[PDB]
Design a protein around this ligand. Structure first.
Ligand SMILES: Cc1cccc2cccc(N3CCc4c(nc(OC[C@@H]5CCCN5C)nc4N4C[C@H]5CC[C@@H](C4)N5)C3)c12
Ligand SMILES: Nc1nc2c(ncn2[C@@H]2O[C@H](COP(=O)(O)OP(=O)(O)O)[C@@H](O)[C@H]2O)c(=O)[nH]1
Ligand SMILES: [Mg+2]
Length: 169
């Protein structure tokens, strides 16, 4: 039938978590999407021959650590950790998100992909090599994306899926 994958997109405000998701779900680029709306979106795709139902939690809201919040996040099987290549602070925040993923999942090996989004923009303050260094230290893949042009958007989610497959062994 379908193999279900629960994906969770995390990272600072304004990096493109919603644009990335809606590009995958609805195939268009949203200029302004309510920055406060957190929701899960379901999508059927074929990845490497396998029919997949992706359940994608696009995170938002206040920073808080309620039990309900922890419980929503730890249903994630894999995580897209997203920063913008023109937002140094959002890159620096990646480690915090990874730490919270490890905590709620209670594991050192959680399927994860590092995503530098907005690669269409000229005002790059985060070097590709800087983000690669981080990704290699974590043992995770790294990919640059543009939710605006769709460059790399499919690959980023599919790569996460393949990371979940490897985790299952
Ligand atoms: C995200 C997450 C992943 C995995 C498990 C989690 C478990 C509990 C809570 C999580 N959340 C909930 C959401 C959230 C978390 N951390 C920060 O941290 C911001 C800054 C960064 C440095 C610390 N803090 C000062 N901001 C958040 N939100 C505030 C702004 C920004 C994004 C968006 C949401 N709107 C951590 C988890
Ligand atoms: N140029 C460019 N702008 C983007 C890209 N992704 C998102 N944006 C814009 O960045 C702003 C924040 O995007 P959003 O998806 O709401 O970020 P979120 O807060 O992480 O959900 C919006 O105005 C988007 O139009 C991208 O890949 N390239
Ligand atoms: Mg959003």
């Amino acid at each position: 039938g379908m193999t279900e994958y629960k994906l969770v997109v995390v990272g600072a405000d304004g990096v493109g978590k919603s644009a990335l998701t809606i590009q995958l779900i609805q195939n268009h680029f949203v200029d302004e999407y309510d920055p406060t709306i957190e929701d899960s979106y379901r999508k059927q795709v074929v990845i490497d021959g396998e029919t997949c139902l992706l359940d994608i939690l696009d995170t938002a809201g206040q920073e808080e650590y309620s039990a309900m919040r922890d419980q929503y996040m730890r249903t994630g099987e894999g995580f897209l950790c997203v920063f913008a290549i023109n937002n140094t602070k959002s890159f620096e925040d990646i480690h915090h998100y990874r730490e919270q993923i490890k905590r709620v999942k209670d594991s050192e090996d959680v399927p994860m992909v590092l995503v530098g989004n907005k690669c269409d923009l000229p005002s790059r303050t985060v070097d590709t090599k800087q983000a690669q260094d981080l990704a290699r230290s974590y043992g995770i893949p790294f990919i640059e994306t543009s939710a605006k042009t769709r460059q790399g958007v499919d690959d980023a989610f599919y790569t996460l899926v393949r990371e979940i497959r490897k985790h299952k062994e």
